Amino acid sequence: SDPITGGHYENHNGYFVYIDASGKQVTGLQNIDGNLQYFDDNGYQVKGSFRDVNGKHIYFDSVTGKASSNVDIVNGKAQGYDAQGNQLKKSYVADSSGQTYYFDGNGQPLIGLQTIDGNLQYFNQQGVQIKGGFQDVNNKRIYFAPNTGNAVANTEIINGKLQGRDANGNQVKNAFSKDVAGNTFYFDANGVMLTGLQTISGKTYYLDEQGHLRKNYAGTFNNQFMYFDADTGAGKTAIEYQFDQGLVSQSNENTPHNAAKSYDKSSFENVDGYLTADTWYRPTDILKNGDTWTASTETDMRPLLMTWWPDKQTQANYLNFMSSKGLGITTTYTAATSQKTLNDAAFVIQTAIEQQISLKKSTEWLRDAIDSFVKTQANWNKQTEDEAFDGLQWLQGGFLAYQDDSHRTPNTDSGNNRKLGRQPINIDGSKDTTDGKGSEFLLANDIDNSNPIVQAEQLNWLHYLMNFGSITGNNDNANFDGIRVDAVDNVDADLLKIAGDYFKALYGTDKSDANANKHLSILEDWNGKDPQYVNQQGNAQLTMDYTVTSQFGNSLTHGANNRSNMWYFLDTGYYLNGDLNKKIVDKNRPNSGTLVNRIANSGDTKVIPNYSFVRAHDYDAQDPIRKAMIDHGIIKNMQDTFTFDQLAQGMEFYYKDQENPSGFKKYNDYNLPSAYAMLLTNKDTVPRVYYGDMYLEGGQYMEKGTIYNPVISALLKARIKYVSGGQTMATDSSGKDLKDGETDLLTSVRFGKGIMTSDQTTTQDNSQDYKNQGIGVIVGNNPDLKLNNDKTITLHMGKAHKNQLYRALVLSNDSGIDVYDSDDKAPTLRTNDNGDLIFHKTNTFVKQDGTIINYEMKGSLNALISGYLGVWVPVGASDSQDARTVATESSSSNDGSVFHSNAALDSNVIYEGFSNFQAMPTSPEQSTNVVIATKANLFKELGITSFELAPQYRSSGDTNYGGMSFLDSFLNNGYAFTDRYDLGFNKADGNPNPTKYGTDQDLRNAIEALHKNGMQAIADWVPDQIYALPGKEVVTATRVDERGNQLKDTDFVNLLYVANTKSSGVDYQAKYGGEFLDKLREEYPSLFKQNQVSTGQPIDASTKIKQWSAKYMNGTNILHRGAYYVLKDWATNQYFNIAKTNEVFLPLQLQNKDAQTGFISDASGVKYYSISGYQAKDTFIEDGNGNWYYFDKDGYMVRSQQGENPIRTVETSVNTRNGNYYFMPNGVELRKGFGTDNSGNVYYFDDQGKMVRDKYINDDANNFYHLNVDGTMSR
Amino acid sequence: KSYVADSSGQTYYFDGNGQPLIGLQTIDGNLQYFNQQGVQIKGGFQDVNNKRIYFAPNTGNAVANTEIINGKLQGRDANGNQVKNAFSKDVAGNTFYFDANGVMLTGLQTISGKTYYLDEQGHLRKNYAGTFNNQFMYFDADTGAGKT
Amino acid sequence: YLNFMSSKGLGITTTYTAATSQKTLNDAAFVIQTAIEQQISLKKSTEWLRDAIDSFVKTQANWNKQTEDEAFDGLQWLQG
């Protein structure tokens, strides 16, 4: 059947009905939103029963009522049916009880023993499949598997002894047989399971006390060591050396030809002196065309991997890969292949290479072949980087922290800076060991804001933005007024003080509220303990108030059906025993509740100044918009890259869902008008309004208003006219649960300019402004809310408004929300003697002149609401009425603080005026900042006092040097940028080069336009990171989580890595970097002398940052390059280098010396030489058959002696590998198995050979073992 | 474009190019997931993406399941979302009901105008006769709903 | 019976159940009886019907081994 959408589900008499978009009750088979359902003739939905439509016999599910497969006992005999209702042939079907039948070619179920797809199965006389049990079919007895039902070997206990049964149902005699768990046993001639050490068929196996065959198990069995095979469990003496490579010399007739022309940067492609897997070098001679050796010319570069390899495994892989590209006999080579053979094979490939270079007259084909091959190898890709997605790692796949390592990577040393996670609550590091350490790593290249030099540069940038117009256009009216601090908890909290003190010095923000409020500044500070920090520090920037944003989520904004009560908005716990009668403040609660109590807020108790919002560019936007794209198959993952066209298509579904007349929302938020009604009437907050609630989040800037625009616009204008004075808030509710009459409808009131209380009748200053001010707001979260006929709902407009006429601004109903622009067009209602507006289930209102109106207090459901909303204002409001308070020039407070929550601060409204998912401008005329200039007027009249612009920085775009791209970057929203000072300047050739938002002139025009209309402009200050730096350096890196803590089980610790950390040095960061600091030090010395908390030091302007590099970074997101992309010799663990001729280290082949490689015995023990010709000391080495060995400081393999403990404690240059290992007599390290010591104690050794302590360990056969603290196994 | 099980009984799915699939995948209309190794999981919960999901012991298919957190059981659906205000199964075959809180409901419960009987363990009882309201009630074999 | 004979061209092919009204089944049995007498005149034989009845009868559980509890354990192995 054809699908339908936009009809609600209703329940009558215990049954689901579905009412169409048409408004018609539905009968018959119906595909509703991709689910196939049925309704009988009364309109009820069928669940857990079969129905007959057309030729089909269709079952519907017992929970959902959705069409699915079942077996029906049609007439006498069972018959299978699919989801579409077709009788099934030659197919399995499971019925409602989870029982399985197989129906044959005629549709009739098979009974008895059967073979299906090579699987033996049994069926009872009713056709049902036996699963997970024995069964006596014929002479035999057969066990059948739990889920497949396939015949399998199993053991059962007959009498008191275990017995073995095979797959054919025959008992096992003189043989090995398994059980379902996975354990192997052996059963003798008499049928009885064997135990202990047993020799059968010339081989010895060890069976434990339980009779389990033990594989990969070491122990002294014959009073002599014995290792039991991983494959079959058969005992080897482990006396024979398993390495297959003797010491061999590699030098031959080609060595001097392929050796390096020079041991320096001329002849070797490199990074900071080091070599990489894809390094090309200049050989002394070149086998041109594969015929004749000729001296090389400077341009004749060849890949290092043509001639050298880190190990035989890599060499073999190189040979196999290049072979596959037509370069020689296609080969299966292994690390086990002899070194000589691999080298000979590499030369026939070299010959072939030189032939295709002559044939193509190009080397680009080879660059691509090498690049591709290199990425194949685990050590040269992300497989050795430990990609993880938990926590902030979710964004880009994981982080590396750079290290101070003056010996190997001195340019990258930070000078003992890089203090990580100095967020506000951990500004002094005193929570470094707990979760209270800040998540310093977020995105891209994380800047080291704990470094004084970098702190000074952030101030330079800050100055540049606050004087952007002066500096870039000599236009003193085109300057930003205030800032938003991006990612506060992901940076060193000193930046707050630096910014605060700058504003104090330059604008005297600590002097008056007028000064402070002229430079409105906000924080993106998510941590729940940030508000109290910010307030202790004097509120230099306004904290967000997540507690109210949160409660909107729970009670209104999130979820179609189940929501927290509106009661929770009150936070009655604020008062002792929620005594709303007694109102005694609770001096000592468990660090909980909403930031500002509004139950009876008369402005008498000091509160923390704040901004608050319902949504943001980065809250309830990014996830829904992507879930919508995922849901319609446009992308697969949240991290996945999408194109702008892909975004546009998804946006169409997002919009369809948002404006859905059904009233249901899958991705979008519910009750946004109702949420704004509360946000915009709340005392003691600077509300912020999200562009995307006013206009559509995609496409062009201001292209099309949202359905919420009228209501929010009305609320905003009404806020100018009526919102002042004290507040009260109550609910028809006392807690989680509602008594009989209770509605849980919230009533929020404001009184007028000087009126602070319910019972206050007049102002102290005898101003009359109050009489036509004030507002009443009623809101619910229940669309199915019906009042009792008894019930009355009251707005206590206050005793300053006795007998006054009030008129509606906004009233909800079943098709939308009506908006009333002026007193004449709206229904009036008059307050009583005590000043209460009384409401009933049914109301008859009269217009002041026009007519009589009917209205029910009814929860409604439509695109604009899921609940109730009523807003009422006093009639008689002047056209120019302004209830706002101007900020006072006087030094009102000696507290030292900048912002103060009061009527003046509350008179402000911030507009967050962009969306991250805007389309790119189709023309210069439609660029955001051009549009803002033409439309400035419109925001003045909505009461916006500060305009929060998007970050104006040039997007890093599609640029991607490694690792996962982020949406900020490819959507060009300005949060991901390469140059911090480029805000849309022209290309150097003179051509325009706008950001997503327009040119730099367009920005200055936009900012001026806002000042011409009395609004401020907010700059997005983004100090935490920078993207896509084009220059490479070699850092020392450790793999870390968001807090900069080393991952628990990582090998990636202090390794050399190639990162992209260096800026172009010829960009706007080079022009303007540090330039304004000297002028500033001269003019305000104390800024440069004042100590910061986290460092104990003042900012350092002695060094200017014209070019970024690794020393000023904490780290980066993993770049998918590999743990050992920077080439290293396994034997000595030293990295190759060619920077200075006095400290060169190269493989000996490349210097035309003789490189010997392999294992060689001597009277003392075994030694090993790497492919580069150096002896292994204090290092682990892996042979060509995959076995691992440790070579001690003296250069000798560690091996166990008879009668001595095989377990050895290893302390190596590579620290991560430290631990206790188990080395066998032939030096092989035991891995992923148990090992007995000389005294009979059992230990376990992990994937990498380390002993495991103090935990339970599980087995593939479901055996559990326990390891004590000292390592021993209690089991 | 085929499944293969290796010697250890671990399963990979190789695509059109012979390269194994990784992450969340739909195959023959079945939702699954393969690890960084490239081997699919069986009878386990992997926290892939935003929410946790149980995997079929032999089929590896996404299925509703319930796991124990603290002392109180929870329900997870086939899409990996926790279940609120709904019935959900576990791998053994028992049905439970979960409220807004997610606590498994117990005893006689009336939801959506129908009455179901959940035993001490929270199992929905089908084809069960008993005097529930002091009055006889037979609970449906199909859905467990009480008829008189 | 009605469904089986219907399948052999003796009338409208029917899905009838035990739930079908007795009246409807009896009416349907007579239209099948009519059809039967026509094929007896057409063929001048009743052997075709003997074979049809024999086949139908074995279809029914009460008239075949399904109600006889076939088992093969012990000497029952030989003949069921």
Ligand SMILES: OC[C@H]1O[C@H](O[C@H]2[C@H](O)[C@@H](O)[C@@H](O)O[C@@H]2CO)[C@H](O)[C@@H](O)[C@@H]1O
């Ligand atoms: O297509 C369903 C299922 O097929 C495979 O399961 C195999 C299993 O891997 C083999 O060892 C074996 O026992 O036969 C089973 C059924 O074919 C895939 O391994 C699995 O991922 C997939 O769900």
Ligand SMILES: OC[C@H]1O[C@H](O)[C@H](O)[C@@H](O)[C@@H]1O
């Ligand atoms: O669909 C796969 C499986 O579903 C079920 O678990 C049935 O018990 C089983 O027989 C079937 O193979």
Ligand SMILES: OC[C@H]1O[C@H](O)[C@H](O)[C@@H](O)[C@@H]1O
């Ligand atoms: O020792 C007497 C008997 O013992 C066990 O039953 C053996 O399985 C059987 O072969 C032997 O005849």
Ligand SMILES: OC[C@H]1O[C@H](O)[C@H](O)[C@@H](O)[C@@H]1O
């Ligand atoms: O998200 C806030 C929630 O925190 C915990 O879940 C509380 O138990 C709950 O009452 C509250 O609503």
Ligand SMILES: [Ca+2]
């Ligand atoms: Ca940071």
